Structures are given as structure tokens and as C-alpha cells.
Amino acid sequence: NENLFASFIAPTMMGLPIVTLIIMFPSLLFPTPKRLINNRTISIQQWLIQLTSKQM
């Protein structure tokens, strides 16, 4: 009888706030450049696609 765990009883809530903002938001994390050489933060997004476009 050394280490007694505890618990807390509380409702676990998957509520539903305003969704159509939250859906659009991980689009603006990815930009798209109209340039030949890019700016070393799109350039590791652009490489990550050219891997898994070569497996599907």
C-alpha cells in the first residue's frame, strides 16, 4: 500500500465550435511561390511531395 493512484471524474467534451474557420486554417500554412528558386521553407514542402508522388 505504497503508491495509491488517483482519478478525477470529469466529462470529456468533443464540443462543436465554429468549424468553417478551423477547416480553412491548415490551407494557409502552405504557401505557393511563383519563382524559380524558392525560399527554403516552401522548398522542404516541395521536396516532401515529390517523394510520395512517386509511390502513388
Binding site: K34, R35, L36, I37
Partner: protein, 49 residues
């Protein structure tokens, strides 16, 4: 002399092509359309790989 007649313009057109080829390379970070002359683009579903 038809080779000296016809290919003389083919020499100068190739000589003028060496002038514009110097123009295109430019700065390292130059353009996404000026590099779209030598390296090609095509219509839908050309590049297989």
C-alpha cells in the same frame, strides 16, 4: 553555292541564338517563365514519370 546561300542565314540565326542564350540565364533566382523556354512544358498528361 546553295549551301553558301541557304545555310548563311542558318549560321546567323544560330549566331543570334547564342546572343539570346546569354540573356536567359541571368540571375540565379531570376524567373519562372524565362526558364520556361529551354526546359519544356506541354499539354495535359505528357510527363509520364
Amino acid at each position: 553555292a546553295e549551301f553558301l546561300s541557304l545555310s548563311k542565314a542558318r549560321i546567323e540565326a544560330y549566331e543570334k541564338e547564342l546572343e539570346k542564350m546569354k540573356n536567359i540565364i541571368p540571375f540565379d533566382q531570376m524567373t519562372i517563365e524565362d526558364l520556361n523556354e529551354v526546359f519544356p512544358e506541354t499539354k495535359l498528361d505528357k510527363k509520364k514519370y
